Paper text:
We created the mutant (77)R-K-S-A-R (M5) that combined these features, carrying positive charges only at positions 77,78, and 81, as well as eliminating all possible multi-basic cleavage motives (Lysine is not recognized by furin at the P4 position). In excellent agreement with the findings above, M5 (Ki = 0.042 ± 0.002 nM) was ~8-fold more potent than M2 and ~36-fold more potent than M3 as well as resistant to auto-activation. Indeed, we could obtain crystals of M5:furin and M2:furin at pH 5.9 and pH 7.0, respectively. The structures of M2:furin and M5:furin were refined to 2.0 Å and 2.4 Å resolution, respectively. Four and three copies of the PC1/3-prodomain:furin complexes were observed in the asymmetric unit for M2:furin and M5:furin, respectively. The main difference between M2:furin and M5:furin is found for the secondary cleavage site loop between Lys73 and Ala83. We also applied crystalline material of the M5:furin complex on a gel, showing that the prodomain was intact. Thus, protonation of His72 at pH 6.0 will change a productive interaction to an unfavored contact, probably destabilizing the conformation of the secondary cleavage site loop.
Proprotein convertases (PCs), including furin and PC1/3 among nine mammalian homologues, mediate the maturation of numerous secreted substrates by proteolytic cleavage. Activation of furin is triggered by two sequential autocatalytic cleavages and subsequent release of the prodomain. In this work, we investigate the structural and functional basis of PC-activation to engineer prodomain-based PC-inhibitors.
Author numbering:
A (entry chain A): 110 to 125, 130 to 574
B (entry chain D): 30 to 72, 83 to 110
Write the structure that this text describes.
């Protein structure tokens, strides 16, 4: 196998301490036949490293209500982001221009939807564009990473997510690849971001070249895996296509990780086009590598898998992803077991611990023995939300941090049926005692009440 | 913050959403993405309420701009 000859390919250190993408290329997997769409601020479809792979069938301009998603050109190049993410996925190879994409033979599209008023309807139009032509949607955007916002998809966007995974791709389910967030400097927790917290989205985090947690990284239990991205000034960054037919070597942040993940999934879908949206998540859990990723919270869960709140299950391994996909057996239909835990409201005060032994819908059609996502839907009041830290312990003993202290969150609105999600008990037996922990991390006299705690289990039998 | 767009859930189908637009005085912009029975209207809690109270509309809401960060 002859590797890319593109001029900036040697600078794509993260391709071939890397994501093991060359190994998938040598197996014959470069993304041919897979369609990926970038939901962002537009895509320079005439870019010399994108035009050859551009697909108008995966593109639309929601902001200006027209098929052409061309970015709006300004002095500051404000609308360069979508083009940078598209080059990470499907930049053309062996044409002497800039570098290559992870899936350099895939068709790439873009939905221009951030350069304008982003409403619930605008998001739903983009998430549901041509769902039987687009296989993978890559989105890095979400609520403000100020460390004090609790926001997620509204009704239309939420429905569009469900419609995608239920009926998209001929029923196999649209793949939504999402970036966990850039609120590290504000001590943000990406479980307060309903887009990455969703079970319908494949949440991806960032690691620096030296294998450390970047300054912008957000820790939460909803993240699934990690790909490389920017770090400090001694560490290299992501090399991709830039606006005005230029090349860039300084693509940063968690927005540079999600498209890399979408490209690896595009390679995986070529190795097995029958994979469901849940199948793809199972593959990521099983093949992701924690090795050489530095984190102080690596913990082994009930099935013996290393898991971190900064990294999820570890680095994406494209070679291992495509290898396991070829002979992967489609998982059984998803089951959803809803268990109401609280019989009465509980006073939080300084510390609250809720223990409940559950049968996981035993004797019912939603009986679960192999867990996938687990949810704790909490409705609580508190006088300073940022002081709360919430943990959820599975019967197997796996400690999931649902919410970490957010020092900038001075809100008194608490949480209203907010679905904190965790991926750390994947493949565990949900039967047994579940423990919820809510404690005040500050020395101040804080007060509040937990009024509803619904434990929502997903998985198979 | 708020825009002049209303989303309504109409189980009757596009024919029902078309009659709804004419009777109440709205502009049917069409189906929202892939949501078969969710439509967007152009013409304000009173405007929203008028849409919701119709027995053909199961859910209605006025659209409003939200802060969305690129990462
Ligand atoms: Ca190239
Ligand atoms: Ca965030
Ligand atoms: Na997610």
């Amino acid at each position: 196998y002859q590797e890319p000859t593109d001029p900036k390919f040697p600078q794509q250190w993260y391709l071939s301490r890397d994501l093991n993408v060359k190994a998938a290329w040598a197996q014959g997997y470069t993304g041919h036949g897979i369609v990926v769409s970038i939901l962002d601020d537009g895509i320079e479809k005439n870019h010399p490293d994108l035009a050859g792979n551009y697909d108008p069938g995966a593109s639309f301009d929601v902001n200006d209500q027209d098929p052409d998603p061309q970015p709006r050109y300004t002095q500051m190049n404000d609308n360069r982001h979508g083009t940078r993410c598209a080059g990470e996925v499907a930049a053309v190879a062996n044409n002497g221009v800039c570098g290559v994409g992870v899936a350099y033979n895939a068709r790439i599209g873009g939905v221009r939807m951030l350069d304008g008023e982003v409403t619930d309807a605008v998001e739903a139009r983009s998430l549901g564009l041509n769902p039987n032509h687009i296989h993978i949607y890559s989105a890095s955007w979400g609520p403000e990473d100020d460390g004090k916002t609790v926001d997620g998809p509204a009704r239309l966007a939420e429905e569009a997510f469900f419609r995608g995974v239920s009926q998209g791709r001929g029923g196999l389910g649209s793949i939504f690849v999402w970036a966990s967030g850039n609120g590290g400097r504000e001590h943000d927790s990406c479980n307060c971001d309903g887009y990455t917290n969703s079970i319908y989205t494949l949440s991806i985090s960032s690691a620096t070249q030296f294998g450390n947690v970047p300054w912008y990284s957000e820790a939460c239990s909803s993240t699934l895996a990690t790909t490389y991205s920017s770090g400090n000034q001694n560490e290299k960054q992501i090399v991709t296509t830039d606006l005005r037919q230029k090349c860039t070597e300084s693509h940063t942040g968690t927005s540079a990780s999600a498209p890399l993940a979408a490209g690896i999934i595009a390679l995986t879908l070529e190795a097995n086009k029958n994979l469901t949206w849940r199948d793809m998540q199972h593959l990521v859990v099983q093949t992701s590598k924690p090795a050489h990723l530095n984190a102080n919270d690596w913990a082994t869960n009930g099935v013996g898998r290393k898991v971190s709140h900064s990294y999820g299950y570890g680095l994406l391994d494209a070679g291992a992803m495509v290898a396991l996909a070829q002979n992967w057996t489609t998982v059984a239909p998803q089951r959803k077991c809803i268990i109401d835990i609280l019989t009465e409201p509980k006073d939080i005060g300084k510390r609250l611990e809720v223990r409940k032994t559950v049968t996981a819908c035993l004797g019912e059609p939603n009986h679960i023995t192999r867990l996938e996502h687990a949810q704790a839907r909490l409705t609580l009041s508190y006088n300073r939300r940022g002081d709360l830290a919430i943990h959820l312990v599975s019967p197997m003993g796996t400690r999931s941090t649902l919410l970490a202290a957010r020092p900038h969150d001075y809100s008194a609105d608490g949480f209203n049926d907010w679905a904190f999600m965790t991926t750390h008990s994947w493949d565990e037996d949900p039967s047994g005692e579940w423990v919820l922990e809510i404690e005040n991390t500050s020395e101040a006299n804080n007060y509040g009440t937990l009024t509803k705690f619904t434990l929502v289990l997903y998985g198979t039998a | 913050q708020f825009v002049n767009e209303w989303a309504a859930e109409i189980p009757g189908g596009p024919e029902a959403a078309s009659a709804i637009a004419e009777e109440l005085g709205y502009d049917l912009l069409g189906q929202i993405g892939s949501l078969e029975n969710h439509y967007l209207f152009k013409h304000a809690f009173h405007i929203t309420k008028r849409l919701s109270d119709d027995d053909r509309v199961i859910w209605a809401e006025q659209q409003y701009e939200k802060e969305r960060s690129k990462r």
